[PDB]
């Protein structure tokens, strides 16, 4: 993938998340990995492994 500039590879699993307020979109973990993502064109949520 290349999600909005962020480069990486893995799976996508659609899970109905919550509380991505308005500006905060990309869900990082504690270690600076990408652990979750919101698309700006569909208002949908995902979780990356």
């Amino acid at each position: 993938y290349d999600l909005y500039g962020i480069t990486g590879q893995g799976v996508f699993k659609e899970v109905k998340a919550d509380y991505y307020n308005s500006w905060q979109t990309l869900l990082y973990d504690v270690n600076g990995n990408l652990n979750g993502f919101r698309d700006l064109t569909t208002n949908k949520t995902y979780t990356i492994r």
């Binding site: 993938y1 290349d2 909005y4 064109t41």
Partner: protein, 49 residues
Amino acid sequence: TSEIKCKTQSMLPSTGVYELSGYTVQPVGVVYRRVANLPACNIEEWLTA
């Protein structure tokens, strides 16, 4: 048979257990998602002002 020879740097190596490289799963698609169509901000219209 070829790759354990590649590790020990020796033809017909000895017995034992040998951990190899690992051979991660090869990804299949070039899918990447950007924000949809936006106007041209035209930095040249501001640099060459």
